[PDB]
Write an enzyme that holds these catalytic residues in place. Structure first.
Site, mmCIF file in Angstrom:
data_model
loop_
_atom_site.group_PDB
_atom_site.id
_atom_site.type_symbol
_atom_site.label_atom_id
_atom_site.label_comp_id
_atom_site.label_asym_id
_atom_site.label_seq_id
_atom_site.Cartn_x
_atom_site.Cartn_y
_atom_site.Cartn_z
ATOM 1 N N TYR A 15 40.403 39.363 28.411
ATOM 2 C CA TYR A 15 41.855 39.333 28.505
ATOM 3 C C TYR A 15 42.418 38.301 27.552
ATOM 4 C CZ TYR A 15 42.174 42.234 32.754
ATOM 5 O OH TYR A 15 42.199 43.271 33.648
ATOM 6 N N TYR A 27 35.686 39.993 31.597
ATOM 7 C CA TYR A 27 35.414 40.942 32.668
ATOM 8 C C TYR A 27 34.532 42.071 32.160
ATOM 9 C CZ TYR A 27 38.962 39.055 35.862
ATOM 10 O OH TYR A 27 39.648 38.199 36.686
ATOM 11 N N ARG A 84 32.325 36.084 40.156
ATOM 12 C CA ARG A 84 32.512 37.070 41.203
ATOM 13 C C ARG A 84 32.024 38.436 40.716
ATOM 14 N NH1 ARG A 84 35.717 38.791 45.548
ATOM 15 N NH2 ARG A 84 37.085 40.582 45.149
ATOM 16 N N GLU A 117 41.583 45.450 47.358
ATOM 17 C CA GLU A 117 40.381 44.693 47.658
ATOM 18 C C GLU A 117 40.401 44.092 49.050
ATOM 19 O OE1 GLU A 117 39.639 41.841 44.544
ATOM 20 O OE2 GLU A 117 39.429 43.465 43.138
#
Lengths: 164, 168
Positions: free
Chosen positions: A19, A25, A47, A70
């Site tokens: 990003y 990610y 995570r 989530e």
């Protein structure tokens, strides 16, 4: 000029992306309604999640949208424009995640009760919206239902990942 | 480099659209400026709700395709895709549980009632979140310029019966 629900150009895709806020990610589109993902850096670095149910649609000839909610209370909606190599994400974080993001840093599948407990304790609000373009740095096709793609936290990957 | 400037919103700011989701719910948006919209709901779960001056995150994700996302005083999150080139629309709405249980509580001109919406948000229940994810058919599109306060200025129930034919 295209079928909206033909996801054959997107299911199986494995992407690594960074990003514009610097957070790295990775996603793997596992089937027509599921993804695995793995966070390498940033607010919630390390995570990772398997078998997240998601809403996946085609919004252009080579542009796909994938959205989900989530166990932490977070909502996500991503655009993957494969034809132009453009990525855009929107993440709607609960306030408690912004306050102590490390609480979410785990293999979530082993900690769903914990995430729900944190979610329900809150504070949920005000929601923080993270809205950023990303640069896609790696893309491959790994087929559907491939459990080998995302199988450990980012910290356990080879140092040259994804050059391997 | 990209073949278009992903930061250039000039093809989307000023757009006024009416559209009907595949579940029959009719909505309307006006992209007022680079980070703001007004919107007006005609039918469905929260028919007759309308909102002015919603802060939003507006981006260009294709030559003629735009994305608009925001979070609301009720706790709702929204992310829309407007593909003008293909006349395709897709919306995702993340409703709090309390909105699903009592949607009428949100049916108002929200700007008159923001503290009330926050009070309902905070009372909850927030969860479980309900996801509505649907394509829509765009039935009207026009350009109205930026910061035009005449585009969305009453509830849908107060519009003339021939709307939007009364417009352009």
């Amino acid at each position: 000029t295209f079928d909206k629900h033909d996801l054959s150009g997107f299911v199986g895709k494995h992407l690594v992306y960074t990003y514009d806020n610097g957070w790295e990610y990775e996603i793997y589109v596992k089937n027509e309604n599921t993804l695995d993902y793995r966070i390498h850096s940033g607010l919630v670095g390390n995570r990772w999640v398997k078998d997240q149910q998601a809403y996946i649609v085609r919004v252009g000839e080579s542009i796909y949208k994938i959205s989900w909610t989530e166990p932490t209370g977070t909502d996500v909606s991503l655009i993957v424009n494969l034809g132009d190599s453009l990525f855009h994400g929107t993440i709607f974080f609960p306030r408690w995640v912004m306050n102590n993001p490390e609480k979410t840093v785990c293999f979530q599948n082993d900690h769903i009760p914990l995430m729900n407990s944190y979610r329900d304790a809150g504070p949920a609000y005000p929601t923080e919206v993270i809205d950023e373009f990303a640069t896609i740095t790696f893309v491959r096709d790994c087929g559907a239902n491939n459990e080998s793609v995302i199988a450990c936290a980012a910290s356990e990957l080879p140092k040259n990942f994804p050059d391997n």
